[PDB]
Amino acid sequence: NNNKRWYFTREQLENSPSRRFGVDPDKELSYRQQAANLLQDMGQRLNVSQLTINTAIVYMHRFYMIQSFTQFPGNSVAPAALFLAAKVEEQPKKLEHVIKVAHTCLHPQESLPDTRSEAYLQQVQDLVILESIILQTLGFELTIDHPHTHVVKCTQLVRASKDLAQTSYFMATNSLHLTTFSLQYTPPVVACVCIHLACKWSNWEIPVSTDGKHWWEYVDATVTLELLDELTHEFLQILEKTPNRLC
Amino acid sequence: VECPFCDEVSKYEKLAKIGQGTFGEVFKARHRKTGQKVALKKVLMENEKEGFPITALREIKILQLLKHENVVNLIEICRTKGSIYLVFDFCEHDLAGLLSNVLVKFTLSEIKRVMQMLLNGLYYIHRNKILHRDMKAANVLITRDGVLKLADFGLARAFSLAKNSQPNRYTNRVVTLWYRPPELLLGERDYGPPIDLWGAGCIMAEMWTRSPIMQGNTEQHQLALISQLCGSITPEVWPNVDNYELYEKLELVKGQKRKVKDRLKAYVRDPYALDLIDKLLVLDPAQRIDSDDALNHDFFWSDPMPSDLKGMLSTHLTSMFEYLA
Amino acid sequence: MEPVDPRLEPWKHPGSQPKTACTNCYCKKCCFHCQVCFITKALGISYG
Ligand SMILES: Nc1ncnc2c1ncn2[C@@H]1O[C@H](COP(=O)(O)OP(=O)(O)NP(=O)(O)O)[C@@H](O)[C@H]1O
Numbered sequence A: 001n002n003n004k005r006w007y008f009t010r011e012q013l014e015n016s017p018s019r020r021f022g023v024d025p026d027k028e029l030s031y032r033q034q035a036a037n038l039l040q041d042m043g044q045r046l047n048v049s050q051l052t053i054n055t056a057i058v059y060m061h062r063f064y065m066i067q068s069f070t071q072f073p074g075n076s077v078a079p080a081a082l083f084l085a086a087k088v089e090e091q092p093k094k095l096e097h098v099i100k101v102a103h104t105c106l107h108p109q110e111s112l113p114d115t116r117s118e119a120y121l122q123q124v125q126d127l128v129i130l131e132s133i134i135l136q137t138l139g140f141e142l143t144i145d146h147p148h149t150h151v152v153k154c155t156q157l158v159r160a161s162k163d164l165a166q167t168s169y170f171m172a173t174n175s176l177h178l179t180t181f182s183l184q185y186t187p188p189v190v191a192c193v194c195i196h197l198a199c200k201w202s203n204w205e206i207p208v209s210t211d212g213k214h215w216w217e218y219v220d221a222t223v224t225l226e227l228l229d230e231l232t233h234e235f236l237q238i239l240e241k242t243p244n245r246l247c
Numbered sequence B: 001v002e003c004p005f006c007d008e009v010s011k012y013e014k015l016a017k018i019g020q021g022t023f024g025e026v027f028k029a030r031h032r033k034t035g036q037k038v039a040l041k042k043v044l045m046e047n048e049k050e051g052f053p054i055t056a057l058r059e060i061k062i063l064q065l066l067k068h069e070n071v072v073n074l075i076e077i078c079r080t081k082g083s084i085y086l087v088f089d090f091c092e093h094d095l096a097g098l099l100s101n102v103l104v105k106f107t108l109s110e111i112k113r114v115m116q117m118l119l120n121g122l123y124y125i126h127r128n129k130i131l132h133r134d135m136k137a138a139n140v141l142i143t144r145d146g147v148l149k150l151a152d153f154g155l156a157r158a159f160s161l162a163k164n165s166q167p168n169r170y171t172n173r174v175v176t177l178w179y180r181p182p183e184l185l186l187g188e189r190d191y192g193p194p195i196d197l198w199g200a201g202c203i204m205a206e207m208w209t210r211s212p213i214m215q216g217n218t219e220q221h222q223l224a225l226i227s228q229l230c231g232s233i234t235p236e237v238w239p240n241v242d243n244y245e246l247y248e249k250l251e252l253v254k255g256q257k258r259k260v261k262d263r264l265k266a267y268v269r270d271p272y273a274l275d276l277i278d279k280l281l282v283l284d285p286a287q288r289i290d291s292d293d294a295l296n297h298d299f300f301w302s303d304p305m306p307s308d309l310k311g312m313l314s315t316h317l318t319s320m321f322e323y324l325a
Numbered sequence C: 001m002e003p004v005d006p007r008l009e010p011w012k013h014p015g016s017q018p019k020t021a022c023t024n025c026y027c028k029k030c031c032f033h034c035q036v037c038f039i040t041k042a043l044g045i046s047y048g
């Protein structure tokens, strides 16, 4: 159950902590991707690796299977998550550097309170406090394996064209932003889902290894063709519900 | 606030302070239900600015990764509704402790056994791309049952197995001075597993000399002591030692000859133990022996063969009169 | 959005920051500048 600790059933994802406080399903699901966008913004501002970003998101997603958006605004939480994520992925940024970029993004209008005011110092603590709550909520489990590993590895193996490669990696970054697969399937499967998809679009049918295994069998042994079709369909429906789908 | 995965430290009942650190640094304690003996180590945060210390985070991340017979074991991470506490499996003694107590006796066979565990533990952590970076007799515990456990990963960090491309830039001022190898004193920043094998070499001598063989007062005094013991640091015995910035800008006696096996000859005696201590305390990292070879060196496979630490642990008495009568 | 060798250790990973500034132009190519322009522009998602 330790390895199964951060993996949930469709029902568990339904009876979330945010749900118990009147938040609606698609309401929640949006905060998730919103939070994931803010994280991807500040993270490119501070120039923290993609890996620092992906980890900051997985912290986010798990933080909200225990805590509720009600009590912890995903905009307060996101800075802290990314702050912690920096150290963890060995590209730390100074608490101040971050309190800055976090302010540029949630308040382009106003201007940074004085690094001496009561409000500034005050918040420098709110961030610090939040990181302590994120740490206790994730149970101090900080090592995050991502889909991008198994994706790269796999494309190299099938000698996928440069375009299929980049596209499969691109879809893994999105599964993190858009879906909660991160909370339902192991990274290797999600990587398989991303390659199966970039392949539909490329109408490429990866050859079946000489009298043997299918490509996804060199990425994960529990994957089945049936699953990959269901999850792909599931990923696309998510994509179909985004805002703009409703020089 | 909800916290299903970070228990209150109340499940444990404090029993004593282990050592003379700060107010509430390390505590001996027991699980109220199973009675399991643990050691509570408070995550220190007097320096608050970058929030939770990235150093504490590296410890936790590394400890959660390393699980081996010879590596201290982190049970869980607790909290007090604030402080964060690392909870380990309690080990009765630390090597520095036993070595200082000259009333505790070590047979040749039992020292072979201590070095074997120490090096098997180091083989492990290096294997998992981790540098200890603080090897010394005080960070090596030994359980009541005679099992050695590397401890104190507060300065550990991961390293890259890049024989390939670009140079790594790791923090240079690391490892207690008396056990710091040369490469680090000369400014080396792209170091690896050998900095711990040097430290494994000082601790080995202490197995016989009963105390730090190179107690420098300064970085320059340390290199000094190392030159007076191992031989002068020259490009002849350690190729390219030239390149180091500080190589020149640092006083550096140049006539010294290696006297390792001599200076220790008095204490150690056995030939195989002398040879190993000799191959571990080598100036050029690239030539310094490693855990894999050290473990297969004749010292471990020659009479007397390694034995358990039962005897040696019985010489550790309960008090004055047992020790003196 | 741009493939990075997973084999590289954490500290050896390149910064996410896109080479060029983010424009306000909406178009198949400006919508695919980086991972922020794609999430915000093309899919219309925003945190504020
Ligand atoms: N599991 C344990 N069981 C018993 N004593 C322990 C244990 N872990 C640590 N200690 C004691 O705490 C001291 C080690 O503290 P340590 O874990 O090395 O943290 P440190 O801060 O880096 N070293 P120090 O400054 O001496 O506290 C050791 O030398 C031991 O005496």
Ligand SMILES: [Mg+2]
Binding pocket: B138, B139, B152
């Ligand atoms: Mg210590």
Ligand SMILES: [Zn+2]
Binding pocket: A247, C025, C026, C027, C029, C030
């Ligand atoms: Zn354009």
Ligand SMILES: [Zn+2]
Binding pocket: C018, C021, C022, C023, C033, C034, C035, C036, C037
């Ligand atoms: Zn852009």
